Symmetry: C4
Subunit: 438 residues, 4 copies
């Protein structure tokens, strides 16, 4: 109703939206910068801290040949050195180190007490680990726990070891997490509770393990306890078509835990355990491949068996392993179908599934003239790269019953990892002259 | 008045309004993020530092059996390895590590100096500790202190070690804390200053310790010292009904320390110093039970003495322990009454307070055809869970006096912890074969 | 518009401008301090670890005298103690620590399996590091990797080890990065694949290694592989006017790596490999100087040869080294022109480039009446200062073939670094008396 | 309006300035705050400073046991190294025994003839308190037959003189890396402390001699820091001859107790201000003579010249020289290296007629002693530095000649504020057992 009063409503409104935008610009920008810093700190502060469980994300690498990881020469050195009488060993890793493991027998090899160390079980045996390619010396070995029946594995945070000790009929296991005990299972069938004698594998903190309690030469009760933080999460009686289970050797990839055991009853074809470390579920069967990997065994047939035991040889065998990855599939055996000597790695594609598969390639590890034993799986789960480098060890057993002109029984170790190249093979024996030992 | 000069006034007023208004909304905001950024920065920096004093917040776990914990097989290994001569062993945990302790006699077992290692006090002895279930060796054994009587514990922040050294009549204690010497305490009765010979116990930095200076059998001058940071907060003469005290085996539940000690003056019924480390006070009595846990000892009566001494066998004893916790009460003793051999643990509800209390459970540890020795209390005040798993070591004695064919005395160690399960029992001998040393 | 329009209009304007100048002045500030922080934050965060690839950014320190650094006296301790039988040693530094390295023979000097350690290659040899100046004991010596020829270097981030193993006709290199295998490489001329047997040298992540495969008595196939993070970036075949290459000893001045090798065919002067590690290329020749530094060799002439072997001595030589840095050029060689005997250093201004060059200074390390052997070079790449300190080692072989008294071959180690002052000189014999070994 | 408009633009400007100003200031004064804060809190994540001797001695009313190896005893059946000239140095986290290695075990045939001092096969080693010097525990710092080693609170300085009599050098190490190297200045067994040195705000004085064991010689005080020669002095004061100093710090002063090898049988004494980097010398005045061999104690001793008796001989020893809190150490015998003892001698350094007012037997006169030297754990908790020392127990030769070697073991004590009862601390080797 007059300019003198509408220009005043004009000078105000025209200066508001200025203020109102500038403020909005300052307002929102102070927000974004302060939201920037709050996230910076948080991350940089998270990063000052650490660790998580490991997940079986990657798959195996292509196996074209095997290369040498480690060797302890144990027996050689401790003809003149305080080196522990062990047997039944295996390799395992932690985020930032891999170490040997074995069941110490309580004496040094020269020690007199090393007499009669061929007995598997007593109050003097103990899961110890020690630095890769060092011996089980008196001064360098770390006792992980007491007894004569072990497994161990890291879950990505810390490690879990399980020792079984006791008389034949009254045995327990203790599950150490983070180096303290947590759980003790008691024998259920009271006839030599036993387990893996090689590393276990964990997906997101779940580490299953395979026990057997019962006849070594008949039906037994095997169980697939799933472990997290040493506590028991669940157990399943064994199911599937494996008819006996002993001394499994295990690996994992693409969130599946495949274990490759010994049939000590009628088997000469190895049983196999498939495990889902999430559902906490398992199936089982035997390697199909006609190519018999136990020990002793009949001679390779043309065609084998998937869901029954390969007959011929009963009440015996050796701990062995495989990597069953389709065609990238390699199996491991003694060379002999009689005794514990020689070792090879056979590419036998589709071994798990194909009851007529045969070898396309190989590599000798030990000649069929030098002595050997047990052998199992592991991988550097914390290695770099995009694939899991398949690796195995083999136990080279000197002493009774084979070279019985010494009174002891101990061993040494050889371990190897996959190569994607095709490498010249050597052979790898214990290296010790038994006669030096008299 | 005008409506120009007065309109000016107006346009400035109205604009002034929102300018302040936008000033303060922007004001208030920096303030807010500033304060919000300052809150994260020190919440974050806090997490990066600090570590606190252990408080005995927990009661004890149900004891239903005992699982093997540690073993060293020392005498077995030391038959052919640089293992130290020792005796008076025990265990004590840190926040990050359980270890074995002993009095070293500054010689290896196969060492000529092993000769006359039966003696108890010498210029050459010392408190060593080592990785659990290793043997005490020259190369891995850490000396905490020089002396011939010892205790150690961890305040939850650092560790205290007490050693005593000297001629019977001139002994003095040195108190180490953080690995450095702190307090010294001279003999008061001029006759062998002594202490627990097994690990002490802490609550809020207060670590009590039972001390003794006088006759092996008289009256003696036992005192309770209340330490913290290796410094003396207080000490008090011994009160209560205890005729005599030595070598207490302590342990901590819900803000209270119970030490079962050794009675030489008459003891086959042990005394029990009970301490409160907040009030800083104690109270001694006896175990009422007719299950006499001292050696040598009379056979067992049907009813025993509740707070006096029943002679029986007289003037000699043995170090030793129990766990006193109503129905969940456990005490151990050598099988034998003659001598330091065999060891059992026995479940005796309310044994301290009931003079007719009888055994309701057992677990042989060492049979009565192998040797044993001193025996003791410790716990991992650091594990996780709702309660403390009771643990004890048993000392396993070889050489003099009971095996005189040899010129020396050493020992191994064994230790069990409790279990919530009824685990089957094994025995646990040292292993050693004397004839191998001859 | 009108008269009042153009007045209000000029109140909006003058007040917009002002507000804007203030908005910009405020925006600009809030921005800056936001930026100030993050930057400060990131930096001050980053300081809470870090680790960059090493860069050869310094020349050599002026060498006026050599001074002592390490010695293990290994053999002397070994007389009575579990030391390992070894040879082919070296020294190499991590950013925080420098270790002696060598190849175990899988046995102790006092062990019976020292019988026959004259042999260069078996299934029982391992690369090893251990504490600088202490001895290669079973207990302190950590296997880097498994092989019978090797090398090792650290990029300032982590460390690369390379072990070659297998039969003569089928050997295989494993490359280790940060303590796990990265890559293998099969033999190419199938004649004892072999490499440096002293440390390698990184520049900004590229660590070149020189390998040989083929004749040792005639003309061979030699390659310079270039590793980063244990992965192969490239491999150049040998080039320029060197004719045979063995046992190269390298160092790094300003972004060059100069490696002095050994002509084991017709060579009695030493080949040289100047590598450009950025362009990942090389070039090669012999040292021009008449001061021949092979072994065995001819007496020295007035004039040597820049570009062919010096003839006169055939199918043999020694590992050794030089530092060629202009007038700051020093050489090492045995004093015996016939045998692995004694060791001296001679300053020879421009040894490499002027075939008339003689000594203008010297120093003795091992008198001629003391055995020596393989020499090699290293520098602690991570010392504070303006230049690198040239260091070297002299393996000192004992036993066969030169002392058949014993059945065995081993070594001890001495090692000097350079000094800008002219210091007195001492002799650094092995130390051992073989008599004792008899 | 053509002036009234000005006034409106003008007035709201001032108000916006008043507002902009306020904002700019609070922002500034709030960002700073956070720049400080973080930077401060960030330094709390990092670490160590140079040690200053800011404290005084504790009151010695007796000495308590600290550590003991049992080296000869254990190393009867154990791969223990032959040593001698031991000592003890603390780092801010551990106290380690140090000695001179001889490059063989004690049952190695190689011990034959290890009596000798200087040989290519010697290094300064070190190992963990009360443990013995073993093959697999003994880490090495440098190489040579003469040494001193001390931490400035940031890190360690080991030192080793190697070489022939007439051409020796000292290589000084800083943080485990050779930094400097010095050469003989009178080419005659260049040598130093044989015990631990002592730092103050990272200057670390070391005492050296090069010259005659048997006459006027060239003794020098080098002033170190991070392994560098800031300065060096020649001897001053009234000490006619210095060897084998045993040094200790308190209240920003380093005090050393050395050995006159030439004519003295009272111990000479270097006092060093580490800051002004300047010193003097004299002798302990006390007629409680302290060296060995030594003449029988007189009534009065000498302050500023050697006490006559026994030329051309000595043993390395130490003392705490702190007014009425002075305590002298010495062998019991005047003749050999046997028994060892502590005596309280109010004002030994200044009072030329001071005699005991108390004392403690460390080692019986029927047992071997040897070298002894001052150390102190400058990184203890408290308001005072606990006076500590070690004694070398020499077994073997020359006094025990039915073996062929010369090893030692260690004993070490620290001061107490209590009057603690006493014991004796022998090596414990039974010589017979070797034969
Ligand atoms: C696999 O391993 C498992 C797990 O361990 C094995 O099972 C274990 O077997 C052992 C060995 O027997 C058991 O330890 C024994 O414990 C018993 C206590 O249990 C009994 O008593 C309880 C109730 O007592 C009351 O009974 C009634 C009313 O209830 C009444 O009449 C009376 O008032 C009394 O108070 C019962 O709860 C218990 O029954 C349960 O447990 C049974 C298993 O034992 C089971 O079978 C039942 O079905 C039921 O579930 C049972 O009846 C102790 O008797 C015994 O301890 C004594 O004996 C040992 C060995 O001889 C000796 O070393 C001990 O010192 C002790 O005896 C001394 O003290 C007494 C008091 O002073 C005295 O009376 C004795 O004469 C003796 O004195 C002598 O010795 C000492 C020193 O040596 C000397 O001072 C004296 O002067 C004199 O010389 C055992 O400790 C475990 O409990 C048991 N574990 C479990 C969970 O079952 C299993 O067998 C294994 N399988 C294989 C294949 O091996
Ligand atoms: C305390 O310790 C200190 C520090 O170590 C001791 O001092 C050190 O002691 C040693 C011994 O002297 C010295 O090393 C020797 O140095 C000589 C070279 O130095 C001399 O020559 C320099 C160059 O002069 C010549 O060339 C130019 C012309 O181009 C010109 O200068 C002149 O015309 C002349 O022609 C001189 O600058 C230098 O003089 C300076 O130094 C003197 C001190 O060194 C000083 O007195 C002077 O005043 C001046 O300041 C000096 O004269 C090295 O060449 C010599 O090495 C040769 O000799 C031995 C054999 O015993 C052997 O180790 C070497 O292999 C070498 O001999 C062979 O090489 C030649 C080339 O092929 C050949 O010609 C020889 O015939 C011989 O070849 C034969 O023998 C070898 C051996 O195996 C065999 O393989 C062949 O096949 C063939 O059979 C020494 O390395 C240090 O330099 C010196 N250090 C310092 C800093 O002083 C001190 O003594 C100690 N104190 C005591 C008393 O203990
Ligand atoms: C040494 O020099 C090279 C470049 O000549 C550096 O390589 C760089 O690595 C850092 C990693 O963050 C980055 O700046 C670049 O990715 C690389 N090259 C550049 C500068 O473009 C190497 O890191 C240098 N190292 C040191 C410690 O000086
Ligand atoms: C801090 O975090 C930011 C964003 O998450 C990132 O750019 C940077 O890597 C971190 N700075 C470090 C690790 O210093
Ligand atoms: C840092 O602080 C914020 C707020 O105080 C908190 O929510 C966050 O969890 C902290 N970061 C870590 C990694 O603990
Ligand atoms: C943080 O980085 C800033 C960037 O200028 C610098 O002043 C300082 O060195 C660092 N402060 C701390 C205490 O780390
Ligand atoms: C860093 O945070 C601490 C801990 O609350 C505080 O006391 C201190 O004042 C902060 N820094 C500064 C110098 O303000």
């Amino acid at each position: 109703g007059s300019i003198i009063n509408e220009t005043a409503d004009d000078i105000v409104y025209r200066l508001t939206v200025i203020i109102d935008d500038r403020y909005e610009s300052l307002k929102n920008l102070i927000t974004l910068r302060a939201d920037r810093l709050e996230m910076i700190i948080n991350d940089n502060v998270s990063t000052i801290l650490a660790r998580d469980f490991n997940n079986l994300t990657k798959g195996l690498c292509t196996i074209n040949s095997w290369h040498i990881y480690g060797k302890d020469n144990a027996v050689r050195i401790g003809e003149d050195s305080d080196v522990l009488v062990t047997r039944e060993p295996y390799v395992s890793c932690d985020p930032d180190e891999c170490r040997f493991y074995a069941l110490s027998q309580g004496t040094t090899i020269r020690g007199k007490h090393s007499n009669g160390t061929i007995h598997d079980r007593s109050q003097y045996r103990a899961l110890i680990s020690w630095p890769l390619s060092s011996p089980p010396t008196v001064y360098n070995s770390r006792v992980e726990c007491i007894g004569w029946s072990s497994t161990s594995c890291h879950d990505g945070k810390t490690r879990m070891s399980i020792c079984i000790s006791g008389p034949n009929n009254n045995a327990s296991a203790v599950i150490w997490y983070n180096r303290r005990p947590v759980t003790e299972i008691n024998t259920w069938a009271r006839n030599i509770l036993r387990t893996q004698e090689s590393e276990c594998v964990c997906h997101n903190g779940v580490c299953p393990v395979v026990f057997t309690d019962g006849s070594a030469t008949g039906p037994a009760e095997t169980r697939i306890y799933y472990f997290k933080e040493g506590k028991i999460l669940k157990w399943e009686p064994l199911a599937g078509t494996a008819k006996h289970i002993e001394e499994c050797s295990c690996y994992g990839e693409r969130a599946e835990i495949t274990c490759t055991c010994r049939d000590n009853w009628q088997g000469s074809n190895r049983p196999v355990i498939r495990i889902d470390p999430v559902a906490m579920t398992h199936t089982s069967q035997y390697i199909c491949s006609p190519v018999l990997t136990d020990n002793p065994r009949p001679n390779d047939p043309t065609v084998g068996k998937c869901n029954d035991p390969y007959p011929g040889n009963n009440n015996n065998g050796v701990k062995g392993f495989s990597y069953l990855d389709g065609v990238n599939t390699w199996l491991g055996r003694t060379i002999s179908i009689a005794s514990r000597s020689g070792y090879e790695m056979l590419k036998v594609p589709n071994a798990l599934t194909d009851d007529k598969s045969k070898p396309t390639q190989g590599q000798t590890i030990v000649l069929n003239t030098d002595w050997s034993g047990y052998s199992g799986s592991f991988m550097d789960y914390w290695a770099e790269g995009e694939c899991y480098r398949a690796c195995f060890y083999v136990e080279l057993i000197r002493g009774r019953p084979k070279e019985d002109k010494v009174w002891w029984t101990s061993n040494s170790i050889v371990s190897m990892c996959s190569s994607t190249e095709f490498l010249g093979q050597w052979d790898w024996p214990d290296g010790a002259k038994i006669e030096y030992f008299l």
